């Protein structure tokens, strides 16, 4: 049977290309297929939409994202196909092989050959497509892994009724280019243009917020009798166009990023709607001006620290950015963009004593505050495993940026800016 | 050697790549060359010729495929395919870094036989 | 690493489920295995020392659980200093997941005398 | 509507899945095909042990020929040959031994309706005959693991002692195969290396195209119209459809790669009446051609926003000034801050352009690392093997711990390429140079 | 600000050594200066050439071409007229010809040796059969075989053929060797 093509917009080359490598005749379709495109390019959405328009096909959907390593990936193929064949052909008396016995790719070929023999009495060769969404998204991945799936079909008995027509999707480009000489039939997705992103969210997210709880409470509160669902869509649609124009340079040409600001700012945007905001979005924009002027993606006196604590951090930044050459020149009475350098603990205490407002000395409280900063992670150490502070080889560095320390010195009345 | 019989039958892309690499070797006085330098010298050697229509057609076929309107590739067409083909045949040895323009391309074959094949 | 996080989380989940009367398939199979809905509460006992690169990946890993209808997840964050440390190390794509439904609480002993 | 039957025949013919009675061998391949045909039949019919390696690049119709001869032998010599298949990627040296035994048992059962393991192949045959074993291998060189090559070292040894004749073939793209086949294995191998012939003239390619695109079966009356129109577009060297092939020929001379684009053109075809309009001009390989290039460096660069581009340009400027070519977020914003000041400064003042905050740039900064414009200072990238990747997934590098604003990056696009690609209508075009 | 800079290099070539050596070695065995000075004084006395419209426009493309390859300051544009007038004065033509313009530009190019200079780092080629020579000859030969027969004649004059394609002798000689 021939394949009907879907109507997916902004992908009207791939939806027609897959009519080539996917067909009811297993003697035509290739043994490997790659769909390549970045995140938010619709590869998962396009492939699933096409399959749901042709129910006569038989396919298995898996996700390497959940299948953390390759061992689950092999096992899921064996397990799902074993179930899927039963679902397709319940009348055939068949036996079972344990899908948990898969340890190496050879065993998959062994198990698959054993399974396919049971279906030798089938009327016709059966074309089967195995689908993995985001192949290169696998958490533990290597170059040699993909070659293991490319040449798998020809190790099967070529007279077998069941043919495994693998399907893969890839995100990156530095991964796919290593396999260019194989000339695997490839269909491509580029990044979406600004115009398409605006239209996609208009078509997708309009119906989502037309029926949210927040507005229909406010509409009754504002007693909007003339409101209609056609107005309801355009009211929500205006929010998408404004937020895109406001934050396209912020988010990018991304659909995932925009789909969250449309969520957070929406209740606050809902609040400013009144009886006078029904018909003029310009006034509604004026009321909600402060929403757009800030991203509000931020999660929200920034650091409650003791007097001893404040001078401890101030002294450390000097150590991490001033050369040891200048320690005697500046403090004795005798680079903002670079990453901080390491320093020794003796350097910190000497400078801390040197600038503290006769000597301050180092009691338990000074060390008690110093260790807390390490616990608070405002100062880092040179280790990651089995932290031992008293080991002499560990060094220290500053984890606090310049802007925070600027405001700390203000509450201290210590003029750091004159030391550089 | 029988290797030269296969060298002489390579596509134009392979011959140009090998010739540019050899010229960069003779300029640098070293064998391995930075991968970005190779694709820069390819453009240098392509455009050092005159603006004659034959040169223009060759350059358009090489860099932007000679397509109708869609164009402006940063590197020549099949620049990866022929690189892998030389790499997978054992002639060309390259180290692995995901940064394209800091990896070194190194030859396995003798210094003389490449020129000998190119001189044929 | 993410591999360790998924296994250990399922190991504890199965052990508690064993007292009713190691991967995400256990989450899918949970209602068929034990006949009850599952509500998971994750307690990040010390957020600061956690490798954010591992944690950022793991949060996305847990996001696949929303396909199931019988599973509900809650996250508890032990924050020592302020929200600012989270806003730096975490990828800004991840943060938009947390902000959709969150509650901000202070539990320090010192509070206005 | 009914033309699809001929279209199916065309699609099946393009894929090489025609029956052996109709399988086509190109003239430039026929010379080596007859040598392969001779050795196989001599080893089977005359019962002589032999060993040969086929050598050529990938996508070179190399293992295709081995299928062709065996597919023909099956039509008349079902009882004469035994085939064993192995591959260097899937079948590891641990699982290689069981791979032969399982496949050997399958063939032995259907025919009738640990050094001794190698000998037991002959013992099973001899006990049931009182049939030449055709070994076929892919990626011969790949078996050069630390474990001894007894997987192959014993097979070439069997050539000397096989009471039932043993013949061995293999595929490999290296020209240095004898480096992988060590001296101990070399002493037993017949060393009949056959480097595959190459495509070296446009006549070879066009005739090979003629071999694929000819229809020599009277399935439908439009077959003659197909062959008429086909040779119309190949009789004139300056044809619109032939224009692509010559350009294909000069760029790369691997025939299957050319087929990769032609099949979509055949597959996208809807009906014979509309097929005539498209096949001549052949404007659908141009769209496919740019499709291959849509996600390259140029393709990614075109879809960015102005702010993403502006930070990218400033990021490149730091890289160009820096001898190492490295930069970080702080330097990128500083040049972004200065360039906004410069643009604002060159404006008449007021008689009585926003600098984005350092927080909001973070999302803009993340997009550029995803899209591979930036890369880490020492980014090794993808590993080659799972064991090597195991160490990578466990080790924690410096970049995973240092702050988000101080991770050193490098650039994939040089400012010169920016100035070559960025539209001159862009406001930051004037900032492309220093 | 110098108009012309000349890079005179001496190479150790046995062939070129004999060419120079035999010139000098026989000269010390065993136009005159009076005419030469008479010529120069005559040329300076009379000719005051004026640049024509056609010669003017070609300077723009000549200077821009060096400009985009960058040290091509506007100083070298003075040489693009100063040398042009001096060539016409030698020609005794009372206007500056376009041939004078292009030859002077070539002279500046040859004096500085741009064709033998690296556009990237400014280094000089020591040597100043190649595959690019092959393809250009191949492509030229392919088109000649068509144009020679595309016209409604079996053959045509080579002078007209050159102007038809240049807008060659070796390529056609090879075809004659192959009897094409
Ligand atoms: N043509 C389109 N029309 C409408 N919506 C679209 C279109 N293309 C993409 N989308 C939307 O964009 C979303 C992008 O997410 P998608 O399913 O493609 O993830 P993905 O790229 O496979 O994921 P990952 O990056 O995690 O591997 C889709 O879920 C869909 O809602
Ligand atoms: N049984 C077959 N039927 C039809 N076409 C086939 C068959 N086997 C291979 N091909 C053809 O072979 C081409 C792919 O390259 P091929 O299989 O010849 O390489 P190979 O010999 O495996 O290469 P390598 O040197 O990498 O081992 C495709 O064009 C495909 O149509």
Curated annotation (Swiss-Prot), chain A:
Binding-site residues, ATP: 37-44
Quaternary data: Component of the origin recognition complex (ORC) composed of at least ORC1, ORC2, ORC3, ORC4, ORC5 and ORC6. Interacts with ORC6. Component of a cullin-RING ligase (CRL)-like complex composed of at least the cullin RTT101, a linker protein MMS1, and the potential substrate receptor ORC5. Interacts with RTT101 and MMS1.
CC per GO annotation: Cul8-RING ubiquitin ligase complex; DNA replication preinitiation complex; nuclear origin of replication recognition complex; nuclear pre-replicative complex; nucleoplasm; nucleus
InterPro entries, alphabetized: AAA_16, ORC5, ORC5_C, ORC5_lid, P-loop_NTPase
GO terms, biological process: DNA replication initiation; pre-replicative complex assembly involved in nuclear cell cycle DNA replication; regulation of DNA replication; silent mating-type cassette heterochromatin formation
Record keywords, A-Z: ATP-binding, DNA replication, Nucleotide-binding, Nucleus
Name under which the protein is recorded: Origin recognition complex subunit 5
UniProt organism field: Saccharomyces cerevisiae (strain ATCC 204508 / S288c) (Baker's yeast)
Localization terms from the record: Nucleus
Curated annotation (Swiss-Prot), chain B:
Other noteworthy facts: Present with 3930 molecules/cell in log phase SD medium.
Family assignment from sequence similarity: Belongs to the ORC1 family.
Comment text on domains: The N-terminus is dedicated to mating-type repression.
Subcellular location: Nucleus
Location of this fragment in the whole protein: 788 to 907 of 914
Protein origin, superkingdom: Eukaryota
Function: Component of the origin recognition complex (ORC) that binds origins of replication. It has a role in both chromosomal replication and mating type transcriptional silencing. Binds to the ARS consensus sequence (ACS) of origins of replication.
Subunit structure: Component of the origin recognition complex (ORC) composed of at least ORC1, ORC2, ORC3, ORC4, ORC5 and ORC6. Interacts with MCM10 and TAH11.
Protein name, entry field: Origin recognition complex subunit 1
Organism listed in the record: Saccharomyces cerevisiae (strain ATCC 204508 / S288c) (Baker's yeast)
Curated annotation (Swiss-Prot), chain C:
Location within or outside the cell: Nucleus
Top-level taxon: Eukaryota
Coiled coil, from the record: none
Disulfide bonds: none
Job of this protein: Component of the origin recognition complex (ORC) that binds origins of replication. It has a role in both chromosomal replication and mating type transcriptional silencing. Binds to the ARS consensus sequence (ACS) of origins of replication.
Oligomer status and interactors: Component of the origin recognition complex (ORC) composed of at least ORC1, ORC2, ORC3, ORC4, ORC5 and ORC6. Interacts with ORC6.
Family from the record: Belongs to the ORC3 family.
The protein, known as: Origin recognition complex subunit 3
Location of this fragment in the whole protein: 138 to 274 of 616
Curated annotation (Swiss-Prot), chain D:
Pfam family, one: ORC4_C
Quaternary assembly: Component of the origin recognition complex (ORC) composed of at least ORC1, ORC2, ORC3, ORC4, ORC5 and ORC6.
Family statement: Belongs to the ORC4 family.
Identification of the protein by name: Origin recognition complex subunit 4
InterPro entries: ORC4, ORC4_C, P-loop_NTPase
MF terms (GO), sorted A to Z: DNA replication origin binding
An individual GO BP term: DNA replication initiation
Lineage, broadest ranks: Eukaryota, Fungi, Dikarya, Ascomycota, Saccharomycotina
């Amino acid at each position: 049977m021939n394949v009907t093509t879907p109507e997916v917009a902004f992908r009207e080359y791939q939806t027609n290309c897959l009519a080539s490598y996917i067909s009811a005749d297993p003697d035509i379709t290739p043994s490997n297929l790659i769909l390549q495109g970045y995140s938010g390019t619709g590869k998962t959405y396009t492939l699933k939409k096409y399959f749901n328009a042709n129910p006569n096909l038989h396919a298995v959907w898996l996700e390497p994202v959940e299948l953390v390593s390759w061992k689950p990936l092999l096992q899921a193929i064996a397990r799902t196909v074993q179930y899927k064949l039963k679902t397709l052909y319940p009348n055939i008396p068949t036996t079972d092989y344990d899908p948990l016995q898969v340890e190496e790719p050879f065993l998959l070929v062994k198990t698959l050959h054993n399974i396919f023999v049971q279906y030798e009495s089938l009327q016709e060769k059966t074309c089967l497509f195995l689908i993995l969404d985001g192949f290169d998204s696998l958490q533990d991945l290597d170059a040699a892994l993909f070659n293991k799936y490319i040449k798998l079909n020809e190790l099967l008995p070529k007279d077998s009724k069941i043919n495994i027509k693998f399907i893969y999707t890839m995100l990156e480009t530095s991964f796919l280019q290593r396999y260019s000489t194989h000339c695997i039939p490839t269909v491509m997705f580029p990044r979406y243009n600004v115009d398409e992103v605006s239209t996609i969210l208009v078509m997708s997210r309009c119906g989502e917020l037309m029926e949210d709880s927040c507005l229909r409470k406010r509409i009754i509160e504002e007693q909007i009798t003339d409101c209609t669902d056609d107005q309801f869509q355009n009211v929500a649609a205006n929010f998408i166009h404004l937020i895109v124009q406001a934050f396209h340079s912020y988010t990018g040409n991304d659909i995932f990023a925009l789909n969250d600001l449309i969520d957070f700012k929406w209740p606050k945007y809902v609040s400013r709607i009144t009886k006078e905001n029904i018909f003029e979005p310009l006034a509604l924009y004026k009321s909600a001006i402060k929403l757009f002027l800030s991203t509000d993606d931020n999660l929200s006196q920034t650091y409650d620290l003791s007097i001893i604590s404040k001078y401890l951090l101030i002294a450390s930044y000097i150590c991490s950015y001033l050369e040891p050459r200048y320690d005697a020149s500046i403090f004795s009475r005798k680079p903002r963009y670079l990453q901080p350098s390491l320093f020794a603990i003796e350097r910190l205490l000497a400078i801390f004593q040197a600038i503290f407002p006769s000597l301050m000395k180092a009691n338990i409280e000074v060390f008690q505050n110093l260790s807390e900063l390490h616990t608070l992670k405002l100062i880092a150490t040179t280790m990651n495993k089995n932290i031992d502070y008293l080991s002499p080889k560990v060094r220290w560095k500053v984890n606090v940026p310049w802007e925070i320390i600027k405001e700390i010195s203000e509450s201290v009345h210590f003029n750091i800016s004159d030391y550089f | 050697s029988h290797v030269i019989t296969f060298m002489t039958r390579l596509s134009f892309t392979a011959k140009l790549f090998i010739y540019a690499l050899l010229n960069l070797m003779k300029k640098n006085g070293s064998q391995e060359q930075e991968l970005g330098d190779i694709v820069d010298e390819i453009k240098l050697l392509i455009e050092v010729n005159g603006s004659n229509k034959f040169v223009m057609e060759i350059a358009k076929t090489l860099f932007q495929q000679g397509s109708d309107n869609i164009s402006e590739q940063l590197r020549i067409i099949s620049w990866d395919f022929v690189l892998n083909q030389l790499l997978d045949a054992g002639i060309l040895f390259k180290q692995t870094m995901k940064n394209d323009r800091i990896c070194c391309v190194k030859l396995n074959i003798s210094v003389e036989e490449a020129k000998r094949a190119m001189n044929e | 690493n993410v591999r360790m996080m998924l296994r250990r989380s399922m190991y504890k989940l199965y052990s508690a489920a064993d007292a009713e009367e190691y991967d995400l398939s256990l989450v899918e199979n949970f209602k068929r295995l034990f006949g009850k809905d599952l509500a998971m509460v994750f307690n990040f006992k010390d957020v600061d020392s956690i490798n954010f690169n591992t944690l950022d990946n793991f949060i996305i890993l847990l996001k696949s659980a929303f396909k199931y209808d019988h599973v509900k997840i809650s996250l508890i964050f032990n924050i020592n200093t302020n929200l600012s440390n989270i806003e730096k190390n975490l990828r800004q794509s991840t943060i938009r997941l947390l902000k959709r439904n969150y509650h901000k609480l202070d539990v320090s002993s010192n509070k206005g005398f | 509507p009914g033309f699809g039957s001929l279209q199916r025949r065309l699609l099946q013919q393009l894929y090489g899945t025609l029956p052996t009675d109709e399988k086509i061998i190109f003239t430039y391949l026929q010379d080596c095909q007859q040598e392969i045909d001779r050795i196989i039949k001599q080893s089977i019919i005359q019962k002589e042990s032999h060993s040969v390696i086929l050598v050529g690049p990938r996508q070179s119709y190399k293992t295709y020929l081995l299928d062709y001869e065996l597919s023909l032998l099956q039509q008349s010599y079902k009882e004469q040959f035994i085939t064993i298949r192995l591959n260097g990627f899937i079948h590891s040296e641990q699982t290689a031994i069981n791979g032969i035994a399982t496949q050997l048992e399958q063939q032995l059962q259907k025919i009738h309706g640990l050094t001794e393991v190698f000998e037991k192949i002959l013992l099973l045959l001899d006990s049931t005959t009182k049939i030449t074993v055709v070994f076929i291998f892919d990626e011969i060189d790949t078996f050069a693991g630390p474990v001894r090559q007894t997987l192959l070292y014993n097979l070439f040894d069997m050539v000397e002692h096989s009471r039932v004749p043993v013949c061995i073939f293999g595929c490999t793209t290296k020209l240095n195969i004898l480096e992988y086949l060590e001296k101990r294995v070399k002493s037993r191998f017949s060393q009949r290396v056959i480097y595959m012939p190459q495509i070296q003239n446009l006549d070879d390619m066009v005739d090979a195209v003629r071999n694929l695109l000819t229809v020599r079966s009277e399935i439908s009356p439009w077959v003659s119209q197909w062959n008429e129109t086909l040779e119309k577009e190949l009789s004139d060297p300056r044809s619109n459809l032939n224009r692509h092939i010559r350009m294909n020929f000069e760029t790369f001379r691997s025939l299957p790669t050319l087929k990769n684009s032609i099949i979509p053109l055949v597959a996208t075809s809807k009906n014979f009446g509309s097929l005539c309009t498209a096949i001549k001009s052949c404007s659908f390989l141009d769209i496919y051609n740019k499709n291959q290039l849509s996600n390259n460096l140029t393709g990614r660069l075109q879809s960015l926003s102005d702010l993403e581009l502006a930070i990218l340009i400033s990021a490149a400027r730091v890289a160009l000034r820096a001898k190492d070519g490295s930069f970080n977020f702080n330097l990128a914003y500083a040049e972004y801050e200065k360039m906004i000041k410069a643009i604002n400064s060159r404006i008449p003042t007021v008689a009585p352009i926003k600098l984005w905050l350092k927080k909001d740039v973070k999302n803009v900064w993340e997009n550029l690392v995803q899209l591979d414009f930036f890369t880490e200072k020492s980014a090794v990238g993808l590993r080659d093997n799972a064991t090597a990747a195991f160490y990578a997934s466990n080790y924690q590098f410096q970049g995973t711990m240092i702050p988000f604003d101080l991770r050193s990056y490098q650039m994939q696009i040089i400012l010169q390429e920016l100035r070559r690609i960025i539209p001159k209508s862009n406001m930051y075009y004037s900032w492309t140079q220093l | 600000r110098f108009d012309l800079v000349y890079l005179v290099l001496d190479k150790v070539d046995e062939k070129n050594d004999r060419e120079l050596a035999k010139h000098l070695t026989n000269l010390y065995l065993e136009l005159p200066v009076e005419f030469l000075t008479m010529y120069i004084s005559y040329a300076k006395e009379h000719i005051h050439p004026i640049i024509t419209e056609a010669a003017k426009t070609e300077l723009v493309r000549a200077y821009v071409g060096m400009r985009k390859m960058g040290t091509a300051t506007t100083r070298q544009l003075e040489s693009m007229i100063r040398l042009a007038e001096a060539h016409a004065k030698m020609k005794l033509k009372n206007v500056v010809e376009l041939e004078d313009v292009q030859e002077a530009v070539r002279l500046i190019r040859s004096a500085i040796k741009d064709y033998a200079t690296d556009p990237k780092t400014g280094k000089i080629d020591m040597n100043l059969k190649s595959v690019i020579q092959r393809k250009l000859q191949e492509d030229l030969s392919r088109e000649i075989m068509n144009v020679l027969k595309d016209q409604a004649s079996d053959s045509m004059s080579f002078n007209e053929l050159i102007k038809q394609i240049n807008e060659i002798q070796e390529a056609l000689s090879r075809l004659q060797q192959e009897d094409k």
